[PDB]
């Protein structure tokens, strides 16, 4: 339910902040929080502002 889609999202936007790319793990970010927010669950949104903390 696009659930998965913002889980694949949140995890490349930790990769490209791990191998050092910030600039293009905040976009992936705001991609992944754009999907999230416009989803029925409230988990979704909790879990990316959660990634937010570790980036």
Same mark, same amino acid.
């Given at each position: 339910?696009?659930?998965?889609?913002?889980?694949?999202? !949140?995890? =490349? %936007? &930790?990769?490209?902040?791990?191998?050092? $790319?910030? /600039?293009?793990?905040?976009?992936? !970010?705001? =991609? %992944? &929080?754009?999907?999230?927010?416009?989803? $029925?669950? /409230?988990?979704?949104?909790?879990?990316?502002?959660?990634?937010?903390?570790?980036?």
């Amino acid at each position: 339910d696009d659930e998965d889609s913002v889980r694949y999202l !949140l995890y =490349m %936007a &930790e990769l490209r902040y791990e191998q050092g $790319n910030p /600039e293009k793990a905040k976009k992936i !970010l705001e =991609m %992944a &929080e754009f999907i999230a927010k416009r989803n $029925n669950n /409230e988990e979704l949104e909790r879990l990316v502002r959660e990634v937010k903390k570790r980036l």
